Amino acid sequence: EEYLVHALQGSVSSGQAHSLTSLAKTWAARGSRSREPSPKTEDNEGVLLTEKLKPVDYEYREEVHWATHQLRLGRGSFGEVHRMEDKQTGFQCAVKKVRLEVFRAEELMACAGLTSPRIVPLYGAVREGPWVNIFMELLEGGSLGQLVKEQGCLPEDRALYYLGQALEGLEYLHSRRILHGDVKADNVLLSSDGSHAALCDFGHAVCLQPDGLGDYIPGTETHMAPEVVLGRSCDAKVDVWSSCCMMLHMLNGCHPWTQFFRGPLCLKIASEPPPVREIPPSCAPLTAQAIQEGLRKEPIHRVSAAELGGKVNRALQQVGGLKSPWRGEYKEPRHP
Ligand SMILES: Nc1ncnc2c1ncn2[C@@H]1O[C@H](COP(=O)(O)OP(=O)(O)OP(O)(O)=S)[C@@H](O)[C@H]1O
Ligand SMILES: [Mg+2]
């Protein structure tokens, strides 16, 4: 690895996941470093995983070999995301811009090389000094979070449908010993037609060591599982808890806890019963039952992503499949 990395450094190369991953480890180390003076030559290095993004003489600089266009797609706690165009190939994709000082190699490790349709393909990453750029398929339907905001709430059938696809994605991750670390609506991306969903945002991902146990800071407070808050050992079940919080979010048009408690929520999530009281009463028995098994406080008793995927698939059948329209009528969220 050490020899490989040395070769990659200073250059933007076409290559494969492991190369990107190995280089990304060096980036995390440099982000921790003390403030230094800017040199005259700003380091430009990375690797791209598709020939639709082409370096030129081992360089890939914004406003030279590529550019952003139009308004921002979105911004989370760590990165701004834009549409982009490669000036050589004309290819369009998304860029997530992250400062080196907050970057984590795991964000790439957790999705470079993967090939689930429920996970955004990673196209590569290059850095211009402290500016990290992460390239990935552009999805024109926005985030599930944006949809929930627009529509107010989602119908039970849309909610079940998307939760199911998320769990397909989590099962793929979990079987590869990857924890997503921040499952929520804002980190699920949609097609133009709203038919396909894919997980994004591996900024809080951790690579579960062969043990299958974890380092792990959670991404979003409202979606934290009790075992996390209690500071105990964490596994993939953490994600299924999160997915059920996202489920509640879609149904009620608001995160769990929020309407009832003022932060911090660590105390509450640990102290209180799981927020199954926030399951709408109008929900079908199989929906309520899935959400309840996913919000078991003891992770050992909590269902796996695969197990829950089954339950929610059947619950969708019970409500009579995906009938509701895409971008339908507004639904008033639960009020406090
Ligand atoms: N590939 C993409 N295509 C379209 N929109 C995207 C894409 N990636 C991200 N977005 C949007 O940009 C937002 C922020 O991107 P994220 O990757 O979630 O960044 P982030 O939330 O800062 O990451 P964390 O907090 O470090 S896990 C998402 O909520 C989406 O709305
Ligand atoms: Mg995000």
mmCIF file of all heavy atoms in Angstrom, residues 225-267:
data_model
loop_
_atom_site.group_PDB
_atom_site.id
_atom_site.type_symbol
_atom_site.label_atom_id
_atom_site.label_comp_id
_atom_site.label_asym_id
_atom_site.label_seq_id
_atom_site.Cartn_x
_atom_site.Cartn_y
_atom_site.Cartn_z
ATOM 1 N N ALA A 225 -29.748 5.638 17.900
ATOM 2 C CA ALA A 225 -30.261 4.481 18.611
ATOM 3 C C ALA A 225 -29.797 4.500 20.070
ATOM 4 O O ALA A 225 -28.736 5.032 20.378
ATOM 5 C CB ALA A 225 -29.814 3.223 17.908
ATOM 6 N N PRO A 226 -30.561 3.900 21.015
ATOM 7 C CA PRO A 226 -30.229 3.967 22.442
ATOM 8 C C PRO A 226 -28.846 3.438 22.820
ATOM 9 O O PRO A 226 -28.196 3.995 23.706
ATOM 10 C CB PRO A 226 -31.337 3.126 23.108
ATOM 11 C CG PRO A 226 -32.464 3.115 22.102
ATOM 12 C CD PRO A 226 -31.777 3.112 20.752
ATOM 13 N N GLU A 227 -28.412 2.351 22.162
ATOM 14 C CA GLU A 227 -27.132 1.735 22.473
ATOM 15 C C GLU A 227 -26.002 2.730 22.214
ATOM 16 O O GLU A 227 -24.989 2.717 22.915
ATOM 17 C CB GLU A 227 -26.898 0.418 21.728
ATOM 18 C CG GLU A 227 -26.852 0.534 20.207
ATOM 19 C CD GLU A 227 -28.174 0.265 19.505
ATOM 20 O OE1 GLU A 227 -29.221 0.715 20.018
ATOM 21 O OE2 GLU A 227 -28.148 -0.370 18.426
ATOM 22 N N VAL A 228 -26.186 3.599 21.214
ATOM 23 C CA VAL A 228 -25.203 4.619 20.880
ATOM 24 C C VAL A 228 -25.075 5.584 22.053
ATOM 25 O O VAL A 228 -23.982 5.799 22.573
ATOM 26 C CB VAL A 228 -25.586 5.370 19.588
ATOM 27 C CG1 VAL A 228 -24.653 6.539 19.311
ATOM 28 C CG2 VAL A 228 -25.653 4.440 18.382
ATOM 29 N N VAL A 229 -26.220 6.143 22.447
ATOM 30 C CA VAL A 229 -26.312 7.120 23.520
ATOM 31 C C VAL A 229 -25.732 6.550 24.814
ATOM 32 O O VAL A 229 -25.115 7.286 25.581
ATOM 33 C CB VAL A 229 -27.779 7.540 23.722
ATOM 34 C CG1 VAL A 229 -27.962 8.292 25.028
ATOM 35 C CG2 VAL A 229 -28.310 8.359 22.553
ATOM 36 N N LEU A 230 -25.962 5.255 25.065
ATOM 37 C CA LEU A 230 -25.507 4.630 26.295
ATOM 38 C C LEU A 230 -24.006 4.358 26.230
ATOM 39 O O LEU A 230 -23.418 3.957 27.229
ATOM 40 C CB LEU A 230 -26.311 3.358 26.561
ATOM 41 C CG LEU A 230 -27.796 3.564 26.896
ATOM 42 C CD1 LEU A 230 -28.550 2.242 26.959
ATOM 43 C CD2 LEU A 230 -27.972 4.330 28.202
ATOM 44 N N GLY A 231 -23.396 4.569 25.055
ATOM 45 C CA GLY A 231 -21.959 4.431 24.873
ATOM 46 C C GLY A 231 -21.519 2.967 24.836
ATOM 47 O O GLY A 231 -20.377 2.658 25.172
ATOM 48 N N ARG A 232 -22.422 2.077 24.403
ATOM 49 C CA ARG A 232 -22.178 0.642 24.389
ATOM 50 C C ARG A 232 -21.595 0.234 23.035
ATOM 51 O O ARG A 232 -21.300 1.088 22.200
ATOM 52 C CB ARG A 232 -23.491 -0.086 24.686
ATOM 53 C CG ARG A 232 -24.150 0.396 25.970
ATOM 54 C CD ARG A 232 -25.444 -0.339 26.301
ATOM 55 N NE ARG A 232 -25.358 -1.325 27.387
ATOM 56 C CZ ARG A 232 -26.245 -1.464 28.373
ATOM 57 N NH1 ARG A 232 -27.321 -0.700 28.409
ATOM 58 N NH2 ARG A 232 -26.055 -2.369 29.314
ATOM 59 N N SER A 233 -21.428 -1.078 22.831
ATOM 60 C CA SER A 233 -20.966 -1.615 21.560
ATOM 61 C C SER A 233 -22.066 -1.469 20.507
ATOM 62 O O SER A 233 -23.239 -1.718 20.792
ATOM 63 C CB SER A 233 -20.539 -3.056 21.712
ATOM 64 O OG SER A 233 -19.925 -3.540 20.525
ATOM 65 N N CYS A 234 -21.668 -1.076 19.289
ATOM 66 C CA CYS A 234 -22.608 -0.792 18.216
ATOM 67 C C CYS A 234 -22.384 -1.724 17.030
ATOM 68 O O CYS A 234 -21.248 -2.053 16.712
ATOM 69 C CB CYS A 234 -22.479 0.647 17.738
ATOM 70 S SG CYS A 234 -23.305 1.821 18.836
ATOM 71 N N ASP A 235 -23.487 -2.094 16.367
ATOM 72 C CA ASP A 235 -23.445 -2.959 15.197
ATOM 73 C C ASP A 235 -24.365 -2.381 14.122
ATOM 74 O O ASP A 235 -24.775 -1.228 14.209
ATOM 75 C CB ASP A 235 -23.727 -4.402 15.591
ATOM 76 C CG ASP A 235 -25.096 -4.686 16.191
ATOM 77 O OD1 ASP A 235 -25.965 -3.792 16.126
ATOM 78 O OD2 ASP A 235 -25.270 -5.795 16.743
ATOM 79 N N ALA A 236 -24.688 -3.196 13.114
ATOM 80 C CA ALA A 236 -25.475 -2.737 11.979
ATOM 81 C C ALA A 236 -26.889 -2.326 12.398
ATOM 82 O O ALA A 236 -27.543 -1.569 11.684
ATOM 83 C CB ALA A 236 -25.505 -3.812 10.921
ATOM 84 N N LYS A 237 -27.351 -2.816 13.556
ATOM 85 C CA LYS A 237 -28.716 -2.586 14.014
ATOM 86 C C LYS A 237 -28.986 -1.091 14.197
ATOM 87 O O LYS A 237 -30.115 -0.636 14.024
ATOM 88 C CB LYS A 237 -28.984 -3.369 15.307
ATOM 89 C CG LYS A 237 -28.948 -4.893 15.166
ATOM 90 C CD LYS A 237 -30.110 -5.474 14.362
ATOM 91 C CE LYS A 237 -30.105 -6.975 14.274
ATOM 92 N NZ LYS A 237 -30.228 -7.611 15.591
ATOM 93 N N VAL A 238 -27.934 -0.348 14.551
ATOM 94 C CA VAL A 238 -27.940 1.105 14.616
ATOM 95 C C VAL A 238 -28.646 1.718 13.405
ATOM 96 O O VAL A 238 -29.424 2.656 13.553
ATOM 97 C CB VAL A 238 -26.469 1.557 14.720
ATOM 98 C CG1 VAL A 238 -26.256 2.992 14.265
ATOM 99 C CG2 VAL A 238 -25.924 1.356 16.132
ATOM 100 N N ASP A 239 -28.361 1.192 12.208
ATOM 101 C CA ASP A 239 -28.941 1.700 10.975
ATOM 102 C C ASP A 239 -30.442 1.409 10.890
ATOM 103 O O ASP A 239 -31.184 2.211 10.320
ATOM 104 C CB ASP A 239 -28.228 1.150 9.751
ATOM 105 C CG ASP A 239 -26.897 1.806 9.393
ATOM 106 O OD1 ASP A 239 -26.530 2.818 10.035
ATOM 107 O OD2 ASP A 239 -26.224 1.299 8.467
ATOM 108 N N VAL A 240 -30.896 0.261 11.417
ATOM 109 C CA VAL A 240 -32.287 -0.128 11.234
ATOM 110 C C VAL A 240 -33.126 0.759 12.154
ATOM 111 O O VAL A 240 -34.243 1.150 11.806
ATOM 112 C CB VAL A 240 -32.651 -1.622 11.406
ATOM 113 C CG1 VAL A 240 -31.442 -2.543 11.275
ATOM 114 C CG2 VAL A 240 -33.385 -1.910 12.706
ATOM 115 N N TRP A 241 -32.570 1.093 13.324
ATOM 116 C CA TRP A 241 -33.201 2.063 14.201
ATOM 117 C C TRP A 241 -33.399 3.375 13.450
ATOM 118 O O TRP A 241 -34.485 3.953 13.472
ATOM 119 C CB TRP A 241 -32.364 2.285 15.467
ATOM 120 C CG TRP A 241 -32.915 3.372 16.347
ATOM 121 C CD1 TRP A 241 -32.751 4.714 16.192
ATOM 122 C CD2 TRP A 241 -33.743 3.203 17.516
ATOM 123 N NE1 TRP A 241 -33.416 5.395 17.173
ATOM 124 C CE2 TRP A 241 -34.031 4.496 18.003
ATOM 125 C CE3 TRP A 241 -34.265 2.096 18.193
ATOM 126 C CZ2 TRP A 241 -34.810 4.706 19.140
ATOM 127 C CZ3 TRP A 241 -35.034 2.307 19.315
ATOM 128 C CH2 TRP A 241 -35.301 3.593 19.780
ATOM 129 N N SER A 242 -32.328 3.837 12.800
ATOM 130 C CA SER A 242 -32.348 5.081 12.055
ATOM 131 C C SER A 242 -33.416 5.042 10.962
ATOM 132 O O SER A 242 -34.142 6.019 10.760
ATOM 133 C CB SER A 242 -30.992 5.374 11.478
ATOM 134 O OG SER A 242 -30.031 5.526 12.508
ATOM 135 N N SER A 243 -33.503 3.907 10.256
ATOM 136 C CA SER A 243 -34.442 3.759 9.155
ATOM 137 C C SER A 243 -35.891 3.885 9.644
ATOM 138 O O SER A 243 -36.750 4.392 8.922
ATOM 139 C CB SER A 243 -34.214 2.460 8.431
ATOM 140 O OG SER A 243 -34.421 1.349 9.291
ATOM 141 N N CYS A 244 -36.158 3.426 10.874
ATOM 142 C CA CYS A 244 -37.495 3.509 11.442
ATOM 143 C C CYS A 244 -37.807 4.923 11.926
ATOM 144 O O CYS A 244 -38.971 5.324 11.948
ATOM 145 C CB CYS A 244 -37.685 2.476 12.543
ATOM 146 S SG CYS A 244 -37.876 0.799 11.889
ATOM 147 N N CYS A 245 -36.771 5.677 12.317
ATOM 148 C CA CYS A 245 -36.937 7.092 12.607
ATOM 149 C C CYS A 245 -37.291 7.833 11.318
ATOM 150 O O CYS A 245 -38.187 8.673 11.306
ATOM 151 C CB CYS A 245 -35.698 7.674 13.273
ATOM 152 S SG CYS A 245 -35.374 6.985 14.916
ATOM 153 N N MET A 246 -36.574 7.509 10.237
ATOM 154 C CA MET A 246 -36.861 8.058 8.920
ATOM 155 C C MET A 246 -38.288 7.699 8.510
ATOM 156 O O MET A 246 -38.989 8.509 7.900
ATOM 157 C CB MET A 246 -35.880 7.514 7.879
ATOM 158 C CG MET A 246 -36.075 8.076 6.480
ATOM 159 S SD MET A 246 -34.835 7.471 5.319
ATOM 160 C CE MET A 246 -35.090 5.692 5.290
ATOM 161 N N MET A 247 -38.704 6.470 8.841
ATOM 162 C CA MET A 247 -40.055 6.033 8.538
ATOM 163 C C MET A 247 -41.056 6.958 9.230
ATOM 164 O O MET A 247 -41.965 7.470 8.583
ATOM 165 C CB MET A 247 -40.295 4.583 8.971
ATOM 166 C CG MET A 247 -41.668 4.045 8.567
ATOM 167 S SD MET A 247 -42.050 4.265 6.814
ATOM 168 C CE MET A 247 -43.470 3.178 6.648
ATOM 169 N N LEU A 248 -40.859 7.181 10.535
ATOM 170 C CA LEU A 248 -41.711 8.086 11.293
ATOM 171 C C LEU A 248 -41.701 9.476 10.658
ATOM 172 O O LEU A 248 -42.743 10.126 10.562
ATOM 173 C CB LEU A 248 -41.263 8.134 12.751
ATOM 174 C CG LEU A 248 -41.516 6.870 13.573
ATOM 175 C CD1 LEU A 248 -40.748 6.890 14.886
ATOM 176 C CD2 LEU A 248 -42.999 6.703 13.835
ATOM 177 N N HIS A 249 -40.514 9.920 10.223
ATOM 178 C CA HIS A 249 -40.351 11.226 9.606
ATOM 179 C C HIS A 249 -41.255 11.345 8.378
ATOM 180 O O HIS A 249 -41.922 12.358 8.196
ATOM 181 C CB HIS A 249 -38.873 11.473 9.279
ATOM 182 C CG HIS A 249 -38.600 12.762 8.582
ATOM 183 N ND1 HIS A 249 -37.489 12.951 7.791
ATOM 184 C CD2 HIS A 249 -39.275 13.924 8.568
ATOM 185 C CE1 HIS A 249 -37.504 14.194 7.322
ATOM 186 N NE2 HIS A 249 -38.583 14.798 7.771
ATOM 187 N N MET A 250 -41.271 10.297 7.544
ATOM 188 C CA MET A 250 -42.046 10.306 6.310
ATOM 189 C C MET A 250 -43.545 10.352 6.612
ATOM 190 O O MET A 250 -44.289 11.069 5.941
ATOM 191 C CB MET A 250 -41.716 9.087 5.445
ATOM 192 C CG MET A 250 -40.398 9.219 4.715
ATOM 193 S SD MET A 250 -40.054 7.848 3.596
ATOM 194 C CE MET A 250 -39.601 6.532 4.737
ATOM 195 N N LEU A 251 -43.976 9.592 7.624
ATOM 196 C CA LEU A 251 -45.387 9.475 7.953
ATOM 197 C C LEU A 251 -45.902 10.760 8.601
ATOM 198 O O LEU A 251 -46.951 11.255 8.199
ATOM 199 C CB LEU A 251 -45.601 8.258 8.847
ATOM 200 C CG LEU A 251 -45.336 6.898 8.189
ATOM 201 C CD1 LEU A 251 -45.426 5.780 9.220
ATOM 202 C CD2 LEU A 251 -46.280 6.635 7.018
ATOM 203 N N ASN A 252 -45.157 11.298 9.577
ATOM 204 C CA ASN A 252 -45.628 12.409 10.394
ATOM 205 C C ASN A 252 -45.178 13.765 9.850
ATOM 206 O O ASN A 252 -45.702 14.801 10.266
ATOM 207 C CB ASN A 252 -45.150 12.296 11.836
ATOM 208 C CG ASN A 252 -45.641 11.035 12.505
ATOM 209 O OD1 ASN A 252 -46.838 10.741 12.452
ATOM 210 N ND2 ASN A 252 -44.746 10.285 13.136
ATOM 211 N N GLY A 253 -44.183 13.760 8.951
ATOM 212 C CA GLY A 253 -43.642 14.992 8.400
ATOM 213 C C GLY A 253 -42.762 15.726 9.412
ATOM 214 O O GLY A 253 -42.507 16.914 9.254
ATOM 215 N N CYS A 254 -42.294 14.999 10.437
ATOM 216 C CA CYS A 254 -41.396 15.542 11.442
ATOM 217 C C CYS A 254 -40.605 14.407 12.086
ATOM 218 O O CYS A 254 -41.090 13.284 12.179
ATOM 219 C CB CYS A 254 -42.162 16.318 12.506
ATOM 220 S SG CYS A 254 -43.202 15.264 13.543
ATOM 221 N N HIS A 255 -39.391 14.724 12.546
ATOM 222 C CA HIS A 255 -38.529 13.733 13.166
ATOM 223 C C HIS A 255 -39.179 13.254 14.458
ATOM 224 O O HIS A 255 -39.983 13.981 15.042
ATOM 225 C CB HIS A 255 -37.132 14.307 13.437
ATOM 226 C CG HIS A 255 -36.324 14.601 12.219
ATOM 227 N ND1 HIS A 255 -34.953 14.731 12.269
ATOM 228 C CD2 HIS A 255 -36.672 14.788 10.934
ATOM 229 C CE1 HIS A 255 -34.497 14.983 11.050
ATOM 230 N NE2 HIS A 255 -35.527 15.023 10.225
ATOM 231 N N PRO A 256 -38.856 12.027 14.929
ATOM 232 C CA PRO A 256 -39.228 11.601 16.275
ATOM 233 C C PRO A 256 -38.625 12.508 17.345
ATOM 234 O O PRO A 256 -37.682 13.231 17.071
ATOM 235 C CB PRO A 256 -38.714 10.149 16.378
ATOM 236 C CG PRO A 256 -37.657 10.041 15.293
ATOM 237 C CD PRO A 256 -38.116 10.991 14.197
ATOM 238 N N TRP A 257 -39.222 12.485 18.543
ATOM 239 C CA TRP A 257 -38.762 13.230 19.709
ATOM 240 C C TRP A 257 -39.080 14.727 19.592
ATOM 241 O O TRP A 257 -39.605 15.312 20.540
ATOM 242 C CB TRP A 257 -37.263 13.016 19.967
ATOM 243 C CG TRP A 257 -36.819 11.579 19.947
ATOM 244 C CD1 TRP A 257 -35.977 11.001 19.045
ATOM 245 C CD2 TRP A 257 -37.184 10.536 20.875
ATOM 246 N NE1 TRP A 257 -35.778 9.681 19.354
ATOM 247 C CE2 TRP A 257 -36.509 9.365 20.466
ATOM 248 C CE3 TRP A 257 -38.004 10.472 22.007
ATOM 249 C CZ2 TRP A 257 -36.634 8.155 21.148
ATOM 250 C CZ3 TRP A 257 -38.121 9.277 22.686
ATOM 251 C CH2 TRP A 257 -37.438 8.137 22.265
ATOM 252 N N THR A 258 -38.759 15.333 18.435
ATOM 253 C CA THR A 258 -38.612 16.779 18.300
ATOM 254 C C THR A 258 -39.806 17.530 18.879
ATOM 255 O O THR A 258 -39.624 18.542 19.552
ATOM 256 C CB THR A 258 -38.426 17.176 16.834
ATOM 257 O OG1 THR A 258 -39.520 16.606 16.118
ATOM 258 C CG2 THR A 258 -37.093 16.723 16.281
ATOM 259 N N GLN A 259 -41.020 17.058 18.584
ATOM 260 C CA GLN A 259 -42.210 17.838 18.877
ATOM 261 C C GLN A 259 -42.510 17.829 20.376
ATOM 262 O O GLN A 259 -43.344 18.601 20.840
ATOM 263 C CB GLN A 259 -43.398 17.323 18.058
ATOM 264 C CG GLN A 259 -43.256 17.550 16.557
ATOM 265 C CD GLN A 259 -44.588 17.616 15.842
ATOM 266 O OE1 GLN A 259 -45.459 16.753 16.020
ATOM 267 N NE2 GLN A 259 -44.764 18.655 15.039
ATOM 268 N N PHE A 260 -41.844 16.939 21.126
ATOM 269 C CA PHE A 260 -42.230 16.638 22.498
ATOM 270 C C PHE A 260 -41.140 17.069 23.476
ATOM 271 O O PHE A 260 -41.453 17.460 24.602
ATOM 272 C CB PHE A 260 -42.561 15.142 22.547
ATOM 273 C CG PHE A 260 -43.655 14.745 21.565
ATOM 274 C CD1 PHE A 260 -43.500 13.647 20.724
ATOM 275 C CD2 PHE A 260 -44.823 15.499 21.457
ATOM 276 C CE1 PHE A 260 -44.504 13.300 19.835
ATOM 277 C CE2 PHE A 260 -45.793 15.180 20.527
ATOM 278 C CZ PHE A 260 -45.642 14.069 19.734
ATOM 279 N N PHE A 261 -39.872 17.030 23.043
ATOM 280 C CA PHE A 261 -38.773 17.338 23.939
ATOM 281 C C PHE A 261 -37.884 18.418 23.339
ATOM 282 O O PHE A 261 -37.732 18.494 22.121
ATOM 283 C CB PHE A 261 -37.964 16.072 24.209
ATOM 284 C CG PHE A 261 -38.767 14.924 24.802
ATOM 285 C CD1 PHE A 261 -38.998 13.770 24.065
ATOM 286 C CD2 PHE A 261 -39.261 14.986 26.101
ATOM 287 C CE1 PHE A 261 -39.694 12.703 24.616
ATOM 288 C CE2 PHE A 261 -39.968 13.920 26.643
ATOM 289 C CZ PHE A 261 -40.179 12.774 25.902
ATOM 290 N N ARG A 262 -37.329 19.258 24.219
ATOM 291 C CA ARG A 262 -36.270 20.184 23.842
ATOM 292 C C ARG A 262 -34.934 19.517 24.147
ATOM 293 O O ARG A 262 -34.825 18.780 25.122
ATOM 294 C CB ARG A 262 -36.445 21.548 24.522
ATOM 295 C CG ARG A 262 -37.761 22.236 24.181
ATOM 296 C CD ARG A 262 -38.145 22.044 22.716
ATOM 297 N NE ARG A 262 -39.423 22.679 22.383
ATOM 298 C CZ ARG A 262 -39.624 23.989 22.293
ATOM 299 N NH1 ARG A 262 -38.627 24.836 22.487
ATOM 300 N NH2 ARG A 262 -40.823 24.455 21.983
ATOM 301 N N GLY A 263 -33.945 19.749 23.275
ATOM 302 C CA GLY A 263 -32.691 19.013 23.304
ATOM 303 C C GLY A 263 -31.883 19.334 24.559
ATOM 304 O O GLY A 263 -32.244 20.240 25.305
ATOM 305 N N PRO A 264 -30.779 18.606 24.849
ATOM 306 C CA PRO A 264 -30.338 17.478 24.032
ATOM 307 C C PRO A 264 -31.226 16.258 24.252
ATOM 308 O O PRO A 264 -31.894 16.158 25.276
ATOM 309 C CB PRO A 264 -28.881 17.241 24.498
ATOM 310 C CG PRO A 264 -28.562 18.406 25.416
ATOM 311 C CD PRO A 264 -29.889 18.839 25.992
ATOM 312 N N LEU A 265 -31.185 15.324 23.296
ATOM 313 C CA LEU A 265 -32.102 14.198 23.253
ATOM 314 C C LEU A 265 -31.446 12.920 23.780
ATOM 315 O O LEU A 265 -32.145 11.946 24.046
ATOM 316 C CB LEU A 265 -32.585 14.029 21.815
ATOM 317 C CG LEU A 265 -33.440 15.166 21.245
ATOM 318 C CD1 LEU A 265 -33.699 14.983 19.754
ATOM 319 C CD2 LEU A 265 -34.753 15.253 21.987
ATOM 320 N N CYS A 266 -30.115 12.915 23.939
ATOM 321 C CA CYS A 266 -29.404 11.757 24.459
ATOM 322 C C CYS A 266 -30.143 11.190 25.667
ATOM 323 O O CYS A 266 -30.455 10.001 25.706
ATOM 324 C CB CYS A 266 -27.987 12.106 24.893
ATOM 325 S SG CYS A 266 -27.184 13.312 23.813
ATOM 326 N N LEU A 267 -30.433 12.060 26.640
ATOM 327 C CA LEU A 267 -31.090 11.648 27.868
ATOM 328 C C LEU A 267 -32.404 10.933 27.550
ATOM 329 O O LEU A 267 -32.649 9.829 28.040
ATOM 330 C CB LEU A 267 -31.306 12.884 28.742
ATOM 331 C CG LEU A 267 -32.035 12.659 30.072
ATOM 332 C CD1 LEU A 267 -31.353 11.604 30.929
ATOM 333 C CD2 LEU A 267 -32.157 13.978 30.819
#
